[PDB]
Amino acid sequence: MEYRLKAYYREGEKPSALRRAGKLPGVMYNRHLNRKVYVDLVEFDKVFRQASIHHVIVLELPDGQSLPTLVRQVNLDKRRRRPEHVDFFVLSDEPVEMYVPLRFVEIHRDILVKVSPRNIPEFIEVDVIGDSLHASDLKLPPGVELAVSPEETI
Amino acid sequence: PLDVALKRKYYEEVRPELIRRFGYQNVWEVPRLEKVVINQGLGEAKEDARILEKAAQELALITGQKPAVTRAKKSISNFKLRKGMPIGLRVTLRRDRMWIFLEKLLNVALPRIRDFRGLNPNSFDGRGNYNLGLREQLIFPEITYDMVDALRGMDIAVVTTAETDEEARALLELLGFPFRK
Amino acid sequence: MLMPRRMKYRKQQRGRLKGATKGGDYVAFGDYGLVALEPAWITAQQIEAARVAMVRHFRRGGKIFIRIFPDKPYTKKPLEVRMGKGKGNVEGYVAVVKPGRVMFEVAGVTEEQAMEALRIAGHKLPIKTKIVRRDAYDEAQ
Amino acid sequence: RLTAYERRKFRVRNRIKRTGRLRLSVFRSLKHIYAQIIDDEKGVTLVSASSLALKLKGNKTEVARQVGRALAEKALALGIKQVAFDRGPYKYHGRVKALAEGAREGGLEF
Amino acid sequence: ASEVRIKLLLECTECKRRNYATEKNKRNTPNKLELRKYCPWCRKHTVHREVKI
Amino acid sequence: MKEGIHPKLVPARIICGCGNVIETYSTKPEIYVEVCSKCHPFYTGQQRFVDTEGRVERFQRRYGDSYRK
Amino acid sequence: ARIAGVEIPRNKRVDVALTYIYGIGKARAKEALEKTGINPATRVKDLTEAEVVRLREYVENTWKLEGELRAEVAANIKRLMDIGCYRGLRHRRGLPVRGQRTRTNARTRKGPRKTVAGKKKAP
RNA sequence: GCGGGGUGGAGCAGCCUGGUAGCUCGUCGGGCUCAUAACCCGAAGGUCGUCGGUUCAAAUCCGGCCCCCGCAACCA
RNA sequence: UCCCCCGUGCCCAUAGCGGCGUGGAACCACCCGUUCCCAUUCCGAACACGGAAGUGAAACGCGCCAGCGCCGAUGGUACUGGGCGGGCGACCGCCUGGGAGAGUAGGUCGGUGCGGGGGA
RNA sequence: CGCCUCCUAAAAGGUAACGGAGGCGCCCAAAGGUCCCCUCAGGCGGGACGGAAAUCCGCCGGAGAGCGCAAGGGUAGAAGG
RNA sequence: CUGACUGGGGCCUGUAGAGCACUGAUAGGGCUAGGGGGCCCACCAGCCUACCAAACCCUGUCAAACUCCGAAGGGUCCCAG
């Protein structure tokens, strides 16, 4: 966190035409908008391989806007193992569920957390095969709520 | 209706103390006695004989209320039990017939239990209901060892409007239920 | 050897092998995977051969996830018989396996140990394969 | 989860509502008794009567019969003769029967 | 039908005619079936009795 | 209640051997039991009939100290 | 149930009827009747409900009886087994406790003979 | 390809027709005998090859699996 | 016309579960009784009747809450009618029209017809 | 070798093979008609003999029970008791 | 003039695909009735599972005779060509 990625608008271009043009079709939505977008595939790849559904990606839209999104869905082409479409969930002050990575001082990489977009953390830390831990007994930095059942095994 | 010792005791001693011990705002919140359901799980009477008749006749005398037969729900080979056989006599006691039987049950019946050391405090329901099993019906004064023919105990479900156990343990103790532990 | 412990029916009709894998197309247990590129019925014997391969390379170490399962009964008429007289007897079990399916995953092992072991395992299989590595693309599913 | 009450209500009303008659429906409270002839093809009520409206009082049974005549009276007036008597969840007996005996008395055909 | 589940006629007991054929199980139902049925000759309902088919 | 199927409950005087009278209703006019809730030792709080022992065994195995100090 | 919780048999004498209570042998029967002025020979059937409650009162207040007595018997044996006393080892394996021999007999304490095969003579 | 069989230690009933495991020998204990066999008096031992289903209930009825005997394999 | 309640429909859970709050003037319930009608394979629990002292505790009505349940886009895909190609095959791809399911955003703690009682 | 159920059967109907699975050759005098009332399986908790399972009580429980016997459809707003 | 086929409109369906809510299968993990496993104990208890054991939970799948879903089409009727 954070990362900047170009995004452009689309309206009637074929998804196949855009994919054949090296771009990645997508959509940009939240409670207030919904826009047909396309990112550049090779550009997106390095952004997302670090900024997974964990870290904020900011879409410099060509009209000057810079909307702060999270990646919420990446439909993959099961044959070629390639992103086929992206969901960019635009952030706004309202809360959001999201997966936050876990570092341990190892079942779960991350955890679902009920966060506020200003309170978006990079880390959630754990402590010290086979004894294992659960979500209840965990840190929770300022402003995050356990968006699972604490009965889950980490 | 008609006035009896346990009943007038419930309203006089038990109901005020209950409001004291728990603080009910409404006068219906405070626990009540719903009913006393008596079950003899005979089975011994499955087919061998119709002993249900003398067992009902004594269940009638103990309670002043004729019991209804309970027939077998499903068939069970291991119980030598075909579906629909008469295997129990159950009689629901309410209102005055309930207080009159409980009054005798506390006053004579439970004392007459040999080696009676107190009613099991743990038989409460999690729901404010109480059940207790007996093994001789001659504990009851309407039953003499002359009139009997075979020892037959029963299940006694006393049911209350108490949502919790502690509320119903208070109601049952204050009424005169001797609890052991 | 893998086979359904219990079945509602002994024999199933021969499949069709249309389309990319339905599910299990993303790594979600281990570090590396072996993905099918062409469709096939994969026999329990193939899976087992591919498994022992990765084991005896890991010299009993690491972990091995088998993300396909041979539930489809495979039938075969006795040798030299004529057609008809009903369906042959069940002779083995296959997992229907379509392109993009992650058949195996390995974890708890060096990147070289996984690459090499998955490669040997691919040789025990009647199809072409790809060795893939758990991505955020995977992690986003 | 249904009670025996609403099951009983459905089980007599479904049967009644199939015959295609105007449904003389009878509601009975601990104090009052109510009635409304009802067209279920329109979901619309044509004539009504009740202890609460007529402000009658006294014997529940005797009162039930009176609204029965009171309902029938207004019924014939609007051109209604034939009718299907809906006892809903009640046994055909006592108050509901009294209200029925009076509706016939006033000329409701059922 | 079987050897225990037999066919039988019903005979109007007034004009002695057989008007109905039915079946019974004579092990379950030994007694001769008596059933009121409409008799087309008497043109009225009549207690019919079971006679051998 | 149904008619003709129940025993008639009548005013009944239940007597316990401790001269105790109880006035309830029953299918019997007068009943003489031998123990009631008013005299059962569990009911009488703590009537310890014979057994006050506690224990006194077996450290009251005393009597005496006759090994020389 | 009358005294203690036992219905002592009518039609018999009152000094034998009391023996049918666990805890009352012939000797304790002789006591209570003398200590209560009841004819030790009159039949139970012919005892007034004052004689009944006079004999009853003394009987279950002098000595511990039927159920209770068996508690103090059981808990004593219990304590013998609990501490590891040699009699507790005896009561565990259900063998004699009072120095009797077990090579033969002890059949009361051990029960029906669990007959087993024996050693074989040569042919 | 067809058929029959699996149940105390051995050899056979019970299955057909669902509830009840039976018979001979053997094994064990005791007698008679100087002793042994024979003989006489008693007793024990079988969840019925296995799994699954129908059933209130399966040795028994229905399916698969194991195992073991028997038959057949002709016209070319 | 508007609010409340009673009854009866319609939609067929965006209406349900759970949690909470609230209502007794009225209406509804519980309730008070079991003489009478009627009733219990026993029980006035239910069914029923006669009542009107009490309570909204239960039930019910009305609200709030999105934990569940339920609903649920847009976009992308699968598949496909029809038209075409490719591969030895298993199978795959293109054009045109159609287009899911899952999942994401999000929604929802009902909406309304008719009659009746009360209210302003 | 006739009949019934399901699948194959390509979302109307129909659709073959010595294709994959089952069942029928009865039954019921109520297991029929109608009126009236009642609602299960199972889970947890409580209850003498009493058990995993008899009968009793409380709570949860939309239908997974039941509907004589195969299967499918249907079904508690009953076709179940 | 009603025909094949075609336009609009209504209804009917359960395949493709998908799904796992039911019936089954099913990988790894948590939690856990009946034990095996067992330092021990049976005097009355226990006790611990880097193993099998439902149920529940999480992750991940499969199915002609599974479907919470469900197309394109197909059929039929009406009107029009």
Ligand SMILES: [K+]
């Ligand atoms: K020849």
Ligand SMILES: [Mg+2]
């Ligand atoms: Mg790339």
Ligand SMILES: [Mg+2]
């Ligand atoms: Mg990738």
Ligand SMILES: [Mg+2]
């Ligand atoms: Mg999410």
Ligand SMILES: [Mg+2]
């Ligand atoms: Mg008060």
Ligand SMILES: [Mg+2]
């Ligand atoms: Mg009375």
Ligand SMILES: [Mg+2]
């Ligand atoms: Mg308790």
Ligand SMILES: [Mg+2]
């Ligand atoms: Mg007595």
Ligand SMILES: [Mg+2]
């Ligand atoms: Mg209660």
Ligand SMILES: [Mg+2]
């Ligand atoms: Mg084929």
Ligand SMILES: [Mg+2]
């Ligand atoms: Mg398939």
Ligand SMILES: [Mg+2]
């Ligand atoms: Mg998926």
Ligand SMILES: [Mg+2]
């Ligand atoms: Mg092959």
Ligand SMILES: [Mg+2]
């Ligand atoms: Mg094959």
Ligand SMILES: [Mg+2]
């Ligand atoms: Mg073979």
Ligand SMILES: [Mg+2]
């Ligand atoms: Mg064949």
